[PDB]
């Protein structure tokens, strides 16, 4: 993969100038940039465009007179110039991967320069669907209209259990530095769109689009993603209550259903062949950013004297991943 | 590299208030927008308020006008949230965030959150016993273990185990609310069946509104 810059030459401020950017390798997928540099200082960013040309970004100082085009057929990306100052004097490089960093930007690839010498002589987000499940590999699709026209001030968020949101996509269509390259946005007037083409066990989250085109910056009911797998049986656990718990008035005594899928188990406590119900609470965790799997725990909280009275203590699990029950107990008193 | 770290959630009286603090490393507050976004429990992101630190210039929710105020020191690069006149619909974590790119605006870099719940109930500690592995506690060479992390208010306890050395298999349940109106929740790993016995296990149980770190070790049974 080679870019080769073509155009470059000596104008007078006030002029015109478009450089040709021939990338050769495809290119229809990234987002193409211009960046530019002065000798014995640092090189910074000029332009973007994303891989469909949905939208583009122009440093504060070129806004207005820079445009940045794209033919995703004939593998190049221009920078029409206009209104040329003095200060827009410098060599200017073609970058193919262009990515905000949170410091500047970063490409993947990079032009070898063709110098240019100036001579001075309330919005809402309505998000789709609002629970999505798939398999592994299967192109998903989250859609957010917005209420009014907002351009381009659309940003893509990943949040997981526990954790921040994290920055996706900017600018609709735009890739963060660091983000898998399965992720793509789309824009079309109100419509943004978000693609996740590969989905994988680590795309679990709920996602949001948001606007800051306007006060108050506005967020979308957010896309919670299930990602499916095979069905998975529970290892079931059986936990009795510890002496220090047992020292106060309680016993607590927990099941431990470890990952499994899908998420639907049932759990019945029995307590010598006795059925137990409205003593024992539930809790399921959120499923894995690896393996998929959900886990769930049952505590059933019965007095010091209660637990006193009775010996067997079963837990009994129904699952898909089972042709038949588990049961897994213990006996007070037995070691 | 960039770093935005929250301080001073917790629980807070009805009525009462509370200042979150937000502090920068790795770039100036004068430079970009720094935002408060909050999340009810199990509800979407709402934009809470925003500051330009170098002018001042504020900008706040209907929802939180009147009532909230955000403000910088840039001398400490830090921005605030002070809370007033606190509501119900107020508990929510509190993220804060800032505006970065170049010709465009993105919330690029956020803060850890910070959960502020609005009660009038008291701060208790937990009661952390051991989930001890039994032979009842093992299937084909896999060891369940675990902590019982009961009777907390507010949320949250967060469990960590042998320091931070063992996150794998590890599984921190959601707290669930008890008839006393207390949380418990419960935090198992499993280990293999050859550690037993050979490795030592604890979990770190740390209860921040009360100021709470008990680091109780689950032996066999």
């Known amino acids: 993969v080679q870019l080769v810059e073509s155009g470059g030459g000596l104008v007078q401020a006030g002029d015109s100038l478009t450089l040709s950017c021939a990338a050769s390798?495809?290119?229809?997928?990234?987002?193409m940039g211009w960046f530019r540099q002065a000798p014995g200082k640092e090189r910074k960013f000029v332009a973007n465009i994303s891989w469909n040309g949905d939208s583009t970004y122009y440093t504060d100082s070129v806004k207005g007179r820079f445009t940045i085009s794209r033919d995703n057929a004939k593998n190049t990306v221009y920078l029409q110039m206009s209104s040329l100052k003095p200060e827009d004097t410098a060599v200017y490089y073609c970058?193919?991967?262009?990515?905000?960093?949170?410091?500047?930007?970063?490409?993947?690839?990079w032009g070898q320069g063709t110098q240019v010498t100036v001579s001075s002589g309330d919005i809402q987000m309505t998000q789709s669907p609002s629970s999505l499940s798939a398999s592994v590999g299967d192109r998903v699709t989250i859609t957010c209209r917005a209420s009014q026209d907002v351009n381009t001030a659309v940003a893509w968020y990943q949040q997981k259990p526990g954790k921040a949101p994290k920055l996706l996509i900017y600018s609709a269509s735009f890739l963060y530095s660091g983000v898998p390259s399965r992720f793509s946005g789309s824009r079309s007037g109100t419509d943004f769109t978000l693609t996740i083409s590969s989905l994988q066990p680590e795309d679990f989250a709920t996602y949001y689009c948001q606007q800051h085109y306007t006060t108050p910056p506005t967020f979308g009911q957010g896309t919670k993603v299930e990602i499916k797998r095979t069905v998975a049986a529970p290892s079931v656990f059986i936990f009795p209550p510890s002496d220090e718990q047992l020292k106060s008035g309680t016993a607590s005594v927990v099941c431990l259903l470890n990952n499994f899928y899908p998420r639907e188990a049932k759990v019945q406590w029995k307590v010598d062949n006795a059925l137990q119900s409205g003593n024992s609470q539930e809790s399921v965790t959120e499923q894995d950013s690896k393996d998929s799997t959900y886990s769930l725990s049952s505590t059933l909280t019965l007095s010091k004297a209660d637990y006193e009275k009775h010996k067997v203590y079963a837990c009994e699990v129904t699952h898909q991943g089972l042709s038949s029950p588990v049961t897994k107990s213990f006996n007070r008193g037995e070691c | 590299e960039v770093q935005l770290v929250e301080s001073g959630g917790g629980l807070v009286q009805p009525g009462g208030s509370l200042r979150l603090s937000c502090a920068a490393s790795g770039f100036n507050i004068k430079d970009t927008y720094i935002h408060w976004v909050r999340q009810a429990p199990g509800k979407g992101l709402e934009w809470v308020a925003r500051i330009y630190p170098t002018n001042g210039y504020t900008r706040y929710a209907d929802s939180v006008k009147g009532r909230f105020t955000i403000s910088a020191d840039t001398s400490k690069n830090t921005a605030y949230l002070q809370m007033n006149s606190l509501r119900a619909e107020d508990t929510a974590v509190y993220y804060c965030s800032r505006w970065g790119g170049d010709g465009f605006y993105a919330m690029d870099y956020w803060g850890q959150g910070t959960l502020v719940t609005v009660s009038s109930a008291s701060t208790k500690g937990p009661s952390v016993f051991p989930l001890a592995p039994s032979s009842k506690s093992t299937s084909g060479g896999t060891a369940a273990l675990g902590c019982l992390v009961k009777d907390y208010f507010p949320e949250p306890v967060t469990v960590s185990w042998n320091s931070g050395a063992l996150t794998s298999g590890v599984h921190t349940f959601p707290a669930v609310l008890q008839s006393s109106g207390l949380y418990s929740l419960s935090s198992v790993v499993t280990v293999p069946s050859s550690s037993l016995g050979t490795q030592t296990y604890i979990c770190n149980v740390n209860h921040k509104p009360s100021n709470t770190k008990v680091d109780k070790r689950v032996e066999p049974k």
């Open positions: 970058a193919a991967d262009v990515r905000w960093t949170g410091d500047g930007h970063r490409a993947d690839y």
């Open positions: 390798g495809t290119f229809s997928s990234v987002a």
